[PDB]
Each structure stands twice: as C-alpha cells, then as structure tokens.
Design a protein around this ligand. Structure first.
Ligand SMILES: [NH3+]C1CCCCC1
Ligand SMILES: [NH3+]C1CCCCC1
Length: 419
C-alpha cells in the first residue's frame, strides 16, 4: 500500500505536459473494434485501465502493441466474448458489447453482481442496443447481444444523460442500416473525441458536443491515425496546484476550449491566464487566491471532477466561498480531511461553506475518490510540515505519475512503500 509523503509549504512553478484523457482513450480503444484496417491511437496514457483494455482486446483476437501510441489491428477479431477474469476490475468493459454486435452480430460481456436493481450503470447500454434492433439475453453476471442481420438506425430519447450509453449507442450506430438520432446526448469533450475518431475511420456523425447526435450508418469502417485529446481534469488539477501556491505554470499539450468554465473560475480567484492553441499559462504573481462561488453542472458547465480541487482552493483563499455539488450526492469526503489539516468549512446538504485560512498543517489523510485524493496531495504541497496521503493507488490509476510531474514543479514529494 504505497503512500505519498509530502512536505510543504512549496510554491509550484514550471511546466507540465498534460497526458491524453483516459476517459477518451478507453471509448476510442473499444471503438477500434469496428476498424477493419490498422489504427494508431496516439497520446494514450500509461494507466492500469489501458493495460486491462489492451489485454481484453487481445483476448478477442485483436493484435495490440504500445509504447506513447497504441497500435491496433482488429482485422481478425474472432472471439466475441469478454470473460469475467479480464473485465472484473473495469466497468468500461461494457463498451466492447456494441462494437461486437454492430460489426460481427454477436457479443457477450461479464458483469459484476450486486443486490441493488434499478438505474444500474449498464442498463442504458442494454436498452440502447435493444432500440437499435439487438436481441438481448440477460442472466445474472452477464449480458449477451446478437442481431439478425445489421442493427437498424433508430430515434432514441435518453431519459437521463449518460456518457457511457451515448458512447455505446453512437459507436454501434455507425454500422447500422439507416439514421440514428440520440436525443439528450451527453456533451462531454470525450464524447466529441470518440465521435471524431469514428469519423476518421469513415463514420458519418454530426452534432457531437450538442444534445442531439445524428449518425448515418455505413457498411464498414477503415483505419487510420488519431490522437486522443488532452486530459482536461488533469489540466485543471495542475492549474489549481499553481493557483493555490502563489505559483506560475504553463500546461503544454492542453486543449483550452474544453475548460472554459474552469478557466473563468480561476480568473475570478485572481489568476492571470493566457491560452494558446495547445497550452494554458497561469500566474498568481505570488498572491493568495480570492474565494469563488462554484456550482457543478453537466458539461459545458463547471465539472464535478474539479469540485474537490476548487474546495481546497477556497479553503486557503481570502474570503468565504461556497461550493455546490449538483451531480453527486456524497462527494465531500475531502472536507473532513482538510478540516483535520486546519481548514474552516461547514457542510450544509450538498454545499460546503468555506472560510479561507492562510495556511494548513500537515496530517495523515486519505480519500477514496481519485480527485479528492489528488486534492489532498496538493494540500500537502502547501501545508506546513509533513502530510502523508495513504492509498495513493487511487491516484495512480487516473494520473500518469503525478509525483514526478509535481516534483518538476518544485514539490517535495516521495512515494513510500508501506511505512
Ligand atoms: N508495427 C507497429 C508497432 C511497433 C511500432 C511501429 C508500428
Ligand atoms: N455463444 C456466444 C454468445 C455471443 C458471443 C459469442 C459466443
């Protein structure tokens, strides 16, 4: 059980190169199962889920190799069943189902059990494929799908916004007969990236990024080269790292237009920001940030995945700020940990009232959410003394070696194996 020992306070300044988004690389890697010709997917991060995905694709008959790119040859996929042993640690494995049924007419994926029913993650994927004409078979532990001929385009109205089901329906629809229209489609940049990857292969999709996506099915998809977009949450995390430490940073290989809400909030906190084609710079000019008011909402609004980071920013800012979370009902576990580090905050339902303090104090802390855990590491960078963040494997699964990037910005951080 690795931990990070962080010693502060340190001002974080320098340059950081943003990694590709795991949340775009994953749907793209599964969409590659539709490709009849070789594909090179560039800017893919080296994270556990990518390894799990490559192993799963290999089990299906895909030829896969990687470095910064992942090379895929799905010309000879010949096993349409994703087994429990390879999918048990990754819910994203459901994304193998739609491409297999759309291209080969059959697919099966193992699913984890549970006593709870109703609004389970996989449900909308199942009903989406059923609307496209697939026959679905369910038994506890798995979902099997098949189609007699080709899937058929359909007009689908999503009752609730779902990134996962939008990807499943959009990807499978590329090989359906006719036109598919997805109403109330998820608008996330990762949806746009996946749609653009499919178009690079020969698909016909429009409306990605808006609440209505239209797909005109084609007979087959080819191959090509595609570069995964930058991780917007990693970008925001490093921008906040500079903003809370009186720092100055340049994030390279960034995509500013995926962070409009975040950049606006950082400007309200007092940051001097400039943006280029593929970069963002932030300079606090040695100043403490000013408190801000934040309400999370679906993209393109302020992202819930930046909420913990901005809570930390408010907790060391000048003034009182309120953070309101409207996406998740219990995403404030970072707060008690920051209170133990000296922060002043009150939890009122789905809001946290923050009263900024000048300095935090080191403590032994831990959070299970990836973003909350990364925020504790950042707090450790600016807190007086030593902070030990436990169970950092959560961070390791979503950030490509964060301690090395932070160390290059001036952080005093060490990975400790055990104690
Ligand atoms: N054959 C491909 C995989 C290794 C790198 C060059 C292309
Ligand atoms: N008997 C089969 C069910 C669908 C995937 C391939 C195996």
């Amino acid at each position: 059980m690795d931990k990070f020992r962080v010693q502060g306070p340190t001002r974080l300044q320098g340059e950081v190169t943003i990694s590709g988004a795991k949340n775009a690389a994953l749907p793209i890697l599964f969409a590659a199962l539709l490709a009849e010709e070789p594909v090179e997917i560039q800017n893919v991060p080296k994270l556990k889920d990518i390894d799990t995905t490559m192993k799963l694709l290999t089990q299906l008959g895909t030829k896969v190799e990687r470095x910064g790119s992942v090379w895929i040859d799905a010309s000879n996929v010949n096993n349409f069943s994703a087994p429990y042993d390879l999918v048990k640690t990754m819910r994203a494995s459901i994304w193998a189902l739609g491409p297999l049924v759309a291209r080969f007419g059959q697919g099966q994926v193992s699913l984890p059990g549970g006593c709870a029913i109703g609004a389970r993650p996989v449900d909308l994927h199942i009903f989406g494929l059923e609307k496209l004409g697939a026959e679905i078979k369910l038994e506890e532990g798995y979902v099997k799908a098949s189609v007699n001929g080709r899937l058929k385009g359909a007009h689908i109205v999503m009752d609730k916004v779902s990134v996962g089901a939008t990807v499943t329906i959009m990807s499978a629809a590329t090989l359906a007969e006719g036109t598919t229209i997805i109403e109330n489609a998820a608008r996330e940049p990762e949806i746009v990236d996946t749609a653009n990857f499919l178009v690079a292969l020969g698909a016909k999709i429009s409306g990605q990024g808006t609440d209505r996506i239209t797909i005109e099915g084609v007979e087959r998809l080819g191959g090509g080269v595609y570069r995964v977009l930058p991780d917007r949450i990693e970008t925001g995390t490093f921008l906040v790292a500079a903003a809370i430490s009186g720092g100055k940073i340049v994030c390279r290989n960034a995509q500013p237009d995926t962070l409009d809400a975040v950049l606006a909030k950082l400007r309200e906190a007092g940051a001097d920001i400039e943006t280029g084609e593929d970069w963002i710079s932030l300079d606090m000019h040695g100043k403490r940030p000013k408190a801000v008011t934040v309400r999370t909402a679906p993209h393109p609004a302020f992202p819930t995945d930046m909420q913990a980071q901005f809570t930390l920013l408010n907790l060391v800012a000048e003034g009182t700020g309120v953070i309101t979370e409207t996406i998740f009902e219990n995403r404030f576990m970072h707060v008690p940990e920051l209170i133990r580090m000296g922060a002043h905050a009150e939890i009122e339902s789905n809001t946290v009232i923050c009263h900024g303090v000048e300095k935090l104090s080191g403590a032994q802390v831990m959070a299970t959410d990836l973003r909350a855990s990364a925020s504790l590491v950042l707090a450790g960078c600016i807190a007086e003394g030593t902070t030990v963040v436990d169970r950092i494997y959560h961070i390791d699964r979503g950030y490509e070696r964060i301690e090395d990037k932070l160390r290059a910005l001036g952080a005093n951080i060490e990975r400790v194996k055990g104690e």
